[PDB]
Amino acid sequence: MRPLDLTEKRGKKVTIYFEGKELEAYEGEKLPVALLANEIYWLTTSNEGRKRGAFTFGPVPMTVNGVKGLEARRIKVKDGMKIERQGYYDFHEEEIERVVVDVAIIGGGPAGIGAALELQQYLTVALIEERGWLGGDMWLKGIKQEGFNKDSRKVVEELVGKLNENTKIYLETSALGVFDKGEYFLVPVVRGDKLIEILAKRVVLATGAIDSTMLFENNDMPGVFRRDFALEVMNVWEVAPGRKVAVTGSKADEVIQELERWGIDYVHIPNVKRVEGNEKVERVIDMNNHEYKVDALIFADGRRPDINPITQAGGKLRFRRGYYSPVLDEYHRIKDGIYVAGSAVSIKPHYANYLEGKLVGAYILKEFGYDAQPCIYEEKLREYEPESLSIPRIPLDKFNLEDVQICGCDVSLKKVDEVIRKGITDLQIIKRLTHLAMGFCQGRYCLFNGAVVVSQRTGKKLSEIDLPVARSPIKNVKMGILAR
Amino acid sequence: MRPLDLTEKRGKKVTIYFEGKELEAYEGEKLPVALLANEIYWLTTSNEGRKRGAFTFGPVPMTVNGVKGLEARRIKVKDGMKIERQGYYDFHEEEIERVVVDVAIIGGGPAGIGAALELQQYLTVALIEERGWLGGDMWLKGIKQEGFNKDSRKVVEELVGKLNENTKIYLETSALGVFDKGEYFLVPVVRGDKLIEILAKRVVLATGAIDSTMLFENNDMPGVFRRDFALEVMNVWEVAPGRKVAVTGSKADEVIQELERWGIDYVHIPNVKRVEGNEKVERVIDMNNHEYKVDALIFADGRRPDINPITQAGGKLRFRRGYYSPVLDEYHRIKDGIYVAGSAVSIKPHYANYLEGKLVGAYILKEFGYDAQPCIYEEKLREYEPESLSIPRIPLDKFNLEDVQICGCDVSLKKVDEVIRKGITDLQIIKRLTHLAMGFCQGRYCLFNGAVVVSQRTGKKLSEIDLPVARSPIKNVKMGILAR
Ligand SMILES: Cc1cc2nc3c(=O)[nH]c(=O)nc-3n(C[C@H](O)[C@H](O)C(O)COP(=O)(O)O)c2cc1C
Ligand SMILES: Cc1cc2nc3c(=O)[nH]c(=O)nc-3n(C[C@H](O)[C@H](O)C(O)COP(=O)(O)O)c2cc1C
Ligand SMILES: Nc1ncnc2c1ncn2[C@@H]1O[C@H](COP(=O)(O)OP(=O)(O)OP(=O)(O)O)[C@@H](O)[C@H]1O
Ligand SMILES: Nc1ncnc2c1ncn2[C@@H]1O[C@H](COP(=O)(O)OP(=O)(O)OP(=O)(O)O)[C@@H](O)[C@H]1O
Ligand SMILES: [Fe+3]
Ligand SMILES: [Fe+3]
């Protein structure tokens, strides 16, 4: 057992080296998780000298066997592996498959599975998921779940269990976007390092929501965990974020329930001002200047639909219930032939998103001439009012602005605030002046916040501040993979 | 075979007497039909001396064995029976059951049966029908029907076939209205001469549409058949309206198809001005003064929802698509707890009205806690656009107004036109001055026409001329039956 193991691992034991030090890991574990288990948090430094971990926004470039600039999260641990830290900008110096399919479902959470289950009654589908497992956010929980009155992870197993050979599953697979060729849609997809082109008649974006990022002082430092990452390490791998854990944000109960299940000690800090520490977090300070000693901070401030795949697919947005949503016709369509389902549509219980996927799959099944009954899913859905999110009042005056990070790359809240103060309110321009939303997330974890700041400094309402649209490759792909 | 028999009848032969004359009839036949078969049309005279039959608006009081004032349509023929004509106002001088039920469905056409079929999965229903058979208007057809791609009367048999013991059927049973007691509804019902009180939690009005009445000169004279009566005698009993038949109105094809099936010769007169003859029709004259020799005229100018049971139940009306309809909430409710289904709601194919009955039954099943799926019926219904009806321009200037009858009782078009000409436009007042809608139909076959006349003479739009509401007993009941 390593110090942060929640279980004794029974996988094949393996040995790796971090900065020369000999560490034990298990086969199949991903680099940052093996290092966490061994109490190692600080994995890289940004170009302007900011220490960083793997469990919040931003990329983790690491030298993995003399090969510079590999992404830590993507790398499985391997016996004899030589791992080292490096600069942010340090790079290394040194057979297309075509598959035709009826629908192409992007995203493998409850919505995606839902759609696939409905669809494979008669059609051939691609279920595309970049994640390596086929649950959704649901596979991150293991707490009993409403709707299917049954344990979160047990439901996923049941559902995956029910998939046909009519469903081609694509794990560890990144969709690069959707391209309408009139007669079909092209969804180019990357798995391992092969490019696969999926030509489909229909598409469904079952694309999910992403966790909102909280603005407080060293919010990027090692040992801060965004909700999803904390749940992943605890529930998927079985590793604690730390020995004693601070928890914050408006959905902190979801996290606390997991902590309690695993018996991980914690404090609940409703309003975080700052985190401090040399390599990692060791104190958090609240808005009343109270300090708490802890090894990690976990924040959970609500999920918001990931709008990138929507807007690259050519969909339009609406602001409602504290977040941006897809504008849909009466059939959950973004545009003719592209359906949207799940937490991509709105925030609501897993079961609801599951139904919406079935709903969306049923419409296309009806399109195809099969006798489906989308409305039974429709009427089940209405039983679930979509959730709201409070819009954050960022106490700008009360923060030391250069310490609070807005995006992954450079980009402090101060830089953004500065340009707004000089009159610029158009996010298009803000994007260019500061590098907000130009980093390796494409604004996923910062655009909305940038908007909130403009809105706050301006008085201009959020339902009027329109968002820069997502462009060509919605996910990072390198570049060799795309020739010839 | 009698002269107007379409088949040789194999029922028990019986013998009756009309005005002394010995006639042959069959057991189970109703008086006016036996007399028609024997070429007898003129059955009574109105108080102001107008000869009348049984196949258009108005009552048929007859002396049936020295008992004056019995209603011809209601009387079954019986061996030795002595039948005579009489004045309109000639009258004779000389154990309540309580049944509690979940729903009480008023009207036994496809809508009613539809509702009952849905409902008896779990609930106990009363299916109430005054008609003696359980089809609807559908049982009047015997032509292949859309929806259930199958012969009209064969579908009825199939459907009735499927009724449980959870459905109490009440044939030859007149509902007197609906009375909300909060904790339940009272639907008093008359069968034979017993009064039955049905106490139900829910009610559905599956009440039907009635055939519109055409305004032309002697439109009340013997040998004029309203669509429904012509179909009844031909298809239910098997007796021809006449040897050679004139057909008119905008739904004349429905009738012509039946005529052709039975091989009954006919002429199609698109625009009738007048019918003439001593005892019966013998000529019809068109708007261009062309004459045709015939034995009967059949008119079919569209059905309109019967609004009486609706308004006595306390529902409100809307004018759309050329006719008055119930105002419904989003659940086909007139008012809490009273559902409306079928051609009572709108004009559309039998199959659609069948679905609407299932729809309505499913909602109440959901109300009761059972898991029903009203929406599958919902979405099937949308496949059927409700039909329109042209609003008639009555050529008032071109008619001899005192010959064209508006209501059953006295009441010529002239009487109505007169009062309108003297400034009165409120139907409330018209009702009182002339006796329009005070006869033994309660305006069923004349209110709308009265409105059309006002509208035509006034310029005032029909969607603004509101209709006198139906009151206490929606159907005639006598009076002894209601003590003690
Ligand atoms: C000189 C220049 C540099 C740019 N650098 C970046 C960049 O570093 N990251 C990025 O995501 N986009 C970059 N862009 C693309 C901008 O997002 C660009 O204004 C754009 O995408 C146009 O807006 P649209 O894509 O919404 O139409 C750059 C564009 C220009 C002209
Ligand atoms: C003197 C008098 C005679 C009436 N005669 C008849 C009648 O012969 N037939 C009929 O249906 N209603 C008759 N009524 C009832 C009218 O329809 C009456 O104005 C009425 O119903 C009130 O309108 P409401 O029922 O719509 O509230 C009569 C009412 C009065 C006062
Ligand atoms: N471009 C992409 N390529 C492949 N997978 C993607 C892409 N974008 C998003 N996804 C995946 O879609 C999945 C979204 O599932 P998620 O569980 O978040 O939402 P859901 O299925 O609507 O239901 P719920 O939000 O309640 O779990 C995530 O697993 C995410 O990795
Ligand atoms: N007060 C009443 N008591 C008993 N029966 C009634 C009463 N009022 C109307 N009805 C009956 O309701 C039935 C209506 O059925 P009808 O077939 O006209 O309409 P439907 O079932 O909606 O479908 P469709 O119009 O297509 O046939 C008729 O048989 C009529 O006699
Ligand atoms: Fe970024
Ligand atoms: Fe009348």
Side-chain angles (χ1 to χ4, degrees):
Chain A
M1 206 140 337
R2 300 98 103 215
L4 289 180
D5 266 306
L6 263 9
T7 317
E8 176 138 79
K9 306 287 135 66
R10 30 249 275 91
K12 174 194 161 74
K13 205 230 294 299
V14 130
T15 150
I16 60 153
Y17 305 84
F18 180 72
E19 286 310 330
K21 174 160 184 158
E22 188 190 300
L23 302 177
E24 67 149 300
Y26 295 91
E27 178 176 289
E29 282 195 319
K30 285 180 186 317
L31 190 14
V33 167
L35 300 177
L36 171 63
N38 281 301
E39 282 188 300
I40 293 157
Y41 295 76
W42 159 44
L43 304 187
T44 190
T45 308
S46 86
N47 210 231
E48 67 280 335
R50 294 193 58 94
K51 277 156 155 59
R52 292 216 175 115
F55 303 115
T56 196
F57 58 14
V60 201
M62 285 192 311
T63 300
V64 155
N65 258 143
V67 188
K68 309 211 266 272
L70 296 178
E71 232 284 350
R73 306 187 169 98
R74 268 131 64 196
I75 292 300
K76 295 174 194 172
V77 82
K78 213 54 63 87
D79 198 41
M81 201 161 248
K82 263 77 174 288
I83 306 150
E84 301 149 282
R85 295 186 182 100
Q86 55 159 82
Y88 229 40
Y89 295 172
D90 289 322
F91 62 119
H92 190 47
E93 224 143 279
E94 301 78 16
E95 191 72 73
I96 288 159
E97 209 189 327
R98 270 148 141 86
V99 45
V100 175
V101 116
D102 292 301
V103 342
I105 300 148
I106 304 172
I113 302 157
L117 287 175
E118 185 64 6
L119 285 165
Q120 56 176 218
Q121 295 184 83
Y122 312 107
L123 267 10
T124 315
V125 300
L127 194 55
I128 303 157
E129 171 71 69
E130 78 186 317
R131 210 106 89 115
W133 66 84
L134 209 49
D137 187 77
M138 208 168 153
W139 186 249
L140 265 30
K141 267 147 163 157
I143 227 89
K144 214 275 268 276
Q145 223 76 214
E146 66 164 304
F148 352 69
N149 312 287
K150 194 177 198 149
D151 247 85
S152 181
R153 292 163 63 90
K154 263 143 83 67
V155 173
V156 165
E157 286 178 339
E158 191 178 339
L159 264 18
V160 172
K162 307 224 277 302
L163 263 8
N164 282 344
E165 69 296 331
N166 273 179
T167 304
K168 291 94 168 294
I169 299 159
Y170 289 85
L171 298 175
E172 325 209 301
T173 300
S174 284
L176 302 178
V178 167
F179 303 94
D180 196 343
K181 307 302 216 188
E183 280 279 331
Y184 63 93
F185 298 91
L186 175 64
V187 186
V189 124
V190 184
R191 188 227 270 139
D193 69 27
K194 293 212 299 94
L195 171 67
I196 304 154
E197 288 176 359
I198 300 158
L199 313 299
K201 280 274 140 55
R202 283 299 164 263
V203 346
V204 358
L205 304 184
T207 225
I210 60 188
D211 274 289
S212 300
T213 116
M214 294 202 74
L215 269 29
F216 49 88
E217 272 156 32
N218 297 299
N219 52 181
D220 66 331
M221 79 150 60
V224 331
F225 291 72
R226 203 211 286 137
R227 185 205 49 103
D228 49 347
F229 279 106
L231 266 37
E232 193 189 350
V233 298
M234 280 190 280
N235 286 149
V236 167
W237 318 99
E238 295 157 329
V239 171
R243 302 162 69 90
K244 161 89 141 79
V245 142
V247 173
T248 199
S250 67
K251 310 282 283 181
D253 290 337
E254 294 185 60
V255 181
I256 281 153
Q257 287 189 72
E258 300 302 345
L259 265 12
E260 291 212 348
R261 195 176 124 269
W262 281 107
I264 302 168
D265 210 8
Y266 72 89
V267 254
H268 181 13
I269 311 314
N271 59 340
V272 167
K273 150 128 74 83
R274 186 185 190 81
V275 287
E276 289 178 349
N278 170 209
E279 298 196 346
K280 61 193 296 320
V281 338
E282 51 213 26
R283 286 166 312 281
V284 340
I285 328 287
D286 67 25
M287 295 300 283
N288 295 317
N289 305 301
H290 298 297
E291 318 208 353
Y292 311 78
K293 277 172 56 81
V294 280
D295 300 318
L297 166 85
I298 309 169
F299 69 95
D301 211 28
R303 324 213 288 143
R304 299 183 135 74
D306 185 3
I307 54 159
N308 302 47
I310 312 286
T311 64
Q312 189 278 334
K316 297 195 171 321
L317 273 21
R318 216 208 328 95
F319 186 79
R320 261 190 63 190
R321 292 172 185 284
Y323 55 89
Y324 288 97
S325 256
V327 178
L328 298 174
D329 65 17
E330 50 180 311
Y331 299 95
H332 283 255
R333 287 176 316 165
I334 225 48
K335 182 231 260 252
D336 273 358
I338 306 170
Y339 293 73
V340 185
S343 61
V345 172
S346 67
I347 306 308
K348 56 200 177 291
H350 295 297
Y351 184 67
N353 297 321
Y354 171 72
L355 297 166
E356 207 168 46
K358 298 263 228 156
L359 162 69
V360 128
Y363 282 133
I364 102 90
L365 222 51
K366 224 230 263 283
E367 268 195 285
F368 266 75
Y370 297 92
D371 194 282
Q373 337 70 0
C375 66
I376 86 259
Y377 302 122
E378 259 290 10
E379 109 198 313
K380 285 321 204 344
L381 254 185
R382 291 174 46 96
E383 214 68 22
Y384 294 93
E385 178 187 2
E387 280 158 52
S388 322
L389 276 185
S390 269
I391 293 151
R393 285 86 59 266
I394 308 147
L396 298 152
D397 60 322
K398 184 82 109 296
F399 278 141
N400 160 231
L401 261 18
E402 27 140 47
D403 267 1
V404 24
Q405 304 300 291
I406 195 157
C407 301
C409 228
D410 26 320
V411 218
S412 70
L413 186 53
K414 190 197 208 142
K415 289 280 113 74
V416 171
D417 191 70
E418 270 164 25
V419 316
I420 290 165
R421 260 135 37 92
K422 283 340 293 297
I424 285 130
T425 73
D426 186 340
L427 289 163
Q428 224 56 51
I429 310 186
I430 290 144
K431 252 187 84 184
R432 180 75 128 257
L433 291 175
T434 73
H435 249 237
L436 152 136
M438 325 253 279
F440 278 55
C441 304
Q442 286 306 296
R444 270 189 192 80
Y445 299 102
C446 65
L447 247 197
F448 175 75
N449 282 351
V452 171
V453 174
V454 175
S455 201
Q456 203 175 107
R457 281 259 170 269
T458 292
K460 186 145 207 150
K461 200 155 279 183
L462 275 160
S463 40
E464 291 167 39
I465 298 170
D466 28 19
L467 262 42
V469 66
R471 251 68 189 76
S472 183
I474 60 161
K475 288 285 189 200
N476 293 352
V477 55
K478 46 138 80 89
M479 153 175 272
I481 288 162
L482 269 30
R484 151 112 274 179
Chain B
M1 206 140 337
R2 300 98 103 215
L4 289 180
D5 266 306
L6 263 9
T7 317
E8 176 138 79
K9 306 287 135 66
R10 30 249 275 91
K12 174 194 161 74
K13 205 230 294 299
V14 130
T15 150
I16 60 153
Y17 305 84
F18 180 72
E19 286 310 330
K21 174 160 184 158
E22 188 190 300
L23 302 177
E24 67 149 300
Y26 295 91
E27 178 176 289
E29 282 195 319
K30 285 180 186 317
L31 190 14
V33 167
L35 300 177
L36 171 63
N38 281 301
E39 282 188 300
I40 293 157
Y41 295 76
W42 159 44
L43 304 187
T44 190
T45 308
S46 86
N47 210 231
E48 67 280 335
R50 294 193 58 94
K51 277 156 155 59
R52 292 216 175 115
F55 303 115
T56 196
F57 58 14
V60 201
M62 285 192 311
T63 300
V64 155
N65 258 143
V67 188
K68 309 211 266 272
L70 296 178
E71 232 284 350
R73 306 187 169 98
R74 268 131 64 196
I75 292 300
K76 295 174 194 172
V77 82
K78 213 54 63 87
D79 198 41
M81 201 161 248
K82 263 77 174 288
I83 306 150
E84 301 149 282
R85 295 186 182 100
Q86 55 159 82
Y88 229 40
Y89 295 172
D90 289 322
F91 62 119
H92 190 47
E93 224 143 279
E94 301 78 16
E95 191 72 73
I96 288 159
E97 209 189 327
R98 270 148 141 86
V99 45
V100 175
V101 116
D102 292 301
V103 342
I105 300 148
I106 304 172
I113 302 157
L117 287 175
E118 185 64 6
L119 285 165
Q120 56 176 218
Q121 295 184 83
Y122 313 107
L123 267 10
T124 315
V125 300
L127 194 55
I128 303 157
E129 171 71 69
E130 78 186 317
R131 210 106 89 115
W133 66 84
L134 209 49
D137 187 77
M138 208 168 153
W139 186 249
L140 265 30
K141 267 147 163 157
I143 227 89
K144 214 275 268 276
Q145 223 76 214
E146 66 164 304
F148 352 69
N149 312 287
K150 194 177 198 149
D151 247 85
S152 181
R153 292 163 63 90
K154 263 143 83 67
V155 173
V156 165
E157 286 178 339
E158 191 178 339
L159 264 18
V160 172
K162 307 224 277 302
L163 263 8
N164 282 344
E165 69 296 331
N166 273 179
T167 304
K168 291 94 168 294
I169 299 159
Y170 289 85
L171 298 175
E172 325 209 301
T173 300
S174 284
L176 302 178
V178 167
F179 303 94
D180 196 343
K181 307 302 216 188
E183 280 279 331
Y184 63 93
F185 298 91
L186 175 64
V187 186
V189 124
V190 184
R191 188 227 270 139
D193 69 27
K194 293 212 299 94
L195 171 67
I196 304 154
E197 288 176 359
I198 300 158
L199 313 299
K201 280 274 140 55
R202 283 299 164 263
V203 346
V204 358
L205 304 184
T207 225
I210 60 188
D211 274 289
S212 300
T213 116
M214 294 202 74
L215 269 29
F216 49 88
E217 272 156 32
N218 297 299
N219 52 181
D220 66 331
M221 79 150 60
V224 331
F225 291 72
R226 203 211 286 137
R227 185 205 49 103
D228 49 347
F229 279 106
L231 266 37
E232 193 189 350
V233 298
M234 280 190 280
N235 286 149
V236 167
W237 318 99
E238 295 157 329
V239 171
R243 302 162 69 90
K244 161 89 141 79
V245 142
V247 173
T248 199
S250 67
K251 310 282 283 181
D253 290 337
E254 294 185 60
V255 181
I256 281 153
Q257 287 189 72
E258 300 302 345
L259 265 12
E260 291 212 348
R261 195 176 124 269
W262 281 107
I264 302 168
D265 210 8
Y266 72 89
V267 254
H268 181 13
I269 311 314
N271 59 340
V272 167
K273 150 128 74 83
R274 186 185 190 81
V275 287
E276 289 178 349
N278 170 209
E279 298 196 346
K280 61 193 296 320
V281 338
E282 51 213 26
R283 286 166 312 281
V284 340
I285 328 287
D286 67 25
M287 295 300 283
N288 295 317
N289 305 301
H290 298 297
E291 318 208 353
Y292 311 78
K293 277 172 56 81
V294 280
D295 300 318
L297 166 85
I298 309 169
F299 69 95
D301 211 28
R303 324 213 288 143
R304 299 183 135 74
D306 185 3
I307 54 159
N308 302 47
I310 312 286
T311 64
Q312 189 278 334
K316 297 195 171 321
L317 273 21
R318 216 208 328 95
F319 186 79
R320 261 190 63 190
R321 292 172 185 284
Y323 55 89
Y324 288 97
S325 256
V327 178
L328 298 174
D329 65 17
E330 50 180 311
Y331 299 95
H332 282 255
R333 287 176 316 165
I334 225 48
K335 182 231 260 252
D336 273 358
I338 306 171
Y339 293 73
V340 185
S343 61
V345 172
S346 67
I347 306 308
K348 56 200 177 291
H350 295 297
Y351 184 67
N353 297 321
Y354 171 72
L355 297 166
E356 207 168 46
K358 298 263 228 156
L359 161 69
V360 128
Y363 282 133
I364 102 90
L365 222 51
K366 224 230 263 283
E367 268 195 285
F368 266 75
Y370 297 92
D371 194 282
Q373 337 70 0
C375 66
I376 86 259
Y377 302 122
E378 259 290 10
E379 109 198 313
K380 285 321 204 344
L381 254 185
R382 291 174 46 96
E383 214 68 22
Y384 294 93
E385 178 187 2
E387 280 158 52
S388 322
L389 276 185
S390 269
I391 293 151
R393 285 86 59 266
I394 308 147
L396 298 152
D397 60 323
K398 184 82 109 296
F399 278 141
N400 160 231
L401 261 18
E402 27 140 47
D403 267 1
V404 24
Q405 304 300 291
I406 195 157
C407 301
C409 228
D410 26 320
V411 218
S412 70
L413 186 53
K414 190 197 208 142
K415 289 280 113 74
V416 171
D417 191 70
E418 270 164 25
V419 316
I420 290 165
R421 260 135 37 92
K422 283 340 293 297
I424 285 130
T425 73
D426 186 340
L427 289 163
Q428 224 56 51
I429 310 186
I430 290 144
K431 252 187 84 184
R432 180 75 128 257
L433 291 175
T434 73
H435 249 237
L436 152 136
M438 325 253 279
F440 278 55
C441 304
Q442 286 306 296
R444 270 189 192 80
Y445 299 102
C446 65
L447 247 197
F448 175 75
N449 282 351
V452 171
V453 174
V454 175
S455 201
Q456 203 175 107
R457 281 259 170 269
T458 292
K460 186 146 207 150
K461 200 155 279 183
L462 275 160
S463 40
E464 291 167 39
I465 298 170
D466 28 19
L467 262 42
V469 66
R471 251 68 189 76
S472 183
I474 60 161
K475 288 285 189 200
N476 293 352
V477 55
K478 46 138 80 89
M479 153 175 272
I481 288 162
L482 269 30
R484 151 112 274 179

